C-alpha cells in the first residue's frame, strides 16, 4: 500500500505529514526502503525541489516523488488529492522543468543503466557509497567493488565513478585508467543522470586519465 518518507521538511511540516498519514492510514518512516512508495519533497510554488539522497533514491525506484503541497492541499480539503497533480518538475541544479520522477515512473522496463557495470571507486561525502551503489542498481547497473573485478569481454560496458572532492591525493584519480580499461567519471554523471532520468553522455564528466 502507501508508505512515505519526507525530505527537506521542518518538524511542524513533518507533523502535518504525520497528521495526513494518520488520517489516511499511510505508513511514515525515517528511512527509504524497497517498500517506500512515496517521497514527500519540500518544493517552491512551482514544484522545484532540492536534490537529496531521498530525491535520488525516489526516482531510482520509480516511486512517487511529490511536492509537500500534496499534503497540505489534501488536509486543506479533507481528502487525498491524487499524486499525479503534485509531482516535482525538477530541481535547483538540473533545471526547473525536466520531469525526472515522471519519466522514471514511466520506464521500469528500460532502465537508464541497462547493460552497465559500475564501480564506485574511492571516498564519497554526504552520501555513503552503499547508497550510491544501491542507487545505480535500482537503475539496472551491476555493482562492482574492485577495479580489477570488472567483467572482461565485451558483452558489458564498465564505468568508474569517482568523487574528486573527497580525495586529497597526488596520483589518485588522474591515474585510474592505469589500473583498468574503463571510462572514469565524477558522481555528477550518476546524479545528473538519475535526476533527468536520462543516461548522460560521459562526454561532460570524464576525468583525465594518464596513459
Amino acid at each position: 500500500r502507501m508508505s512515505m518518507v519526507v525530505s527537506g521538511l521542518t518538524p511542524e511540516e513533518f507533523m502535518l505529514v504525520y497528521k495526513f498519514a494518520r488520517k489516511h492510514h499511510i505508513t511514515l518512516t525515517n528511512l527509504i526502503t524497497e517498500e517506500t512508495t512515496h517521497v514527500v519533497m519540500k518544493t517552491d510554488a512551482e514544484f522545484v525541489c532540492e536534490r537529496t539522497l531521498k530525491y535520488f533514491l525516489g526516482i531510482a525506484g520509480g516511486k512517487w516523488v511529490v511536492s509537500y503541497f500534496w499534503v497540505t492541499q489534501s488536509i486543506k480539503e479533507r481528502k487525498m488529492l491524487n499524486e499525479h497533480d503534485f509531482e516535482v518538475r525538477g530541481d535547483v541544479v538540473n533545471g526547473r522543468n525536466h520531469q525526472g520522477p515522471k519519466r522514471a515512473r514511466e520506464s521500469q522496463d528500460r532502465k537508464i543503466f541497462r547493460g552497465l557495470e559500475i564501480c564506485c571507486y574511492g571516498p564519497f561525502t554526504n552520501m555513503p557509497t552503499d547508497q550510491l551503489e544501491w542507487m545505480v542498481q535500482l537503475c539496472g547497473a551491476s555493482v562492482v567493488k574492485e577495479l580489477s573485478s570488472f567483467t572482461l569481454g565485451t558483452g558489458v560496458h564498465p564505468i568508474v565513478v569517482v568523487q574528486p572532492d573527497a580525495w586529497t591525493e597526488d596520483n589518485g584519480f588522474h591515474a585510474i585508467g592505469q589500473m583498468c580499461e574503463a571510462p572514469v567519471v565524477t558522481r555528477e554523471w550518476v546524479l545528473d543522470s538519475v535526476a533527468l532520468y536520462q543516461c548522460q553522455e560521459l562526454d561532460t564528466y570524464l576525468i583525465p586519465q594518464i596513459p
Binding site: S7, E50, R51, T52, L53, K54, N126, M127, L191
Partner: peptide
C-alpha cells in the same frame, strides 16, 4: 539532509 545534505544537498548535492
Amino acid at each position: 539532509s545534505p544537498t548535492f
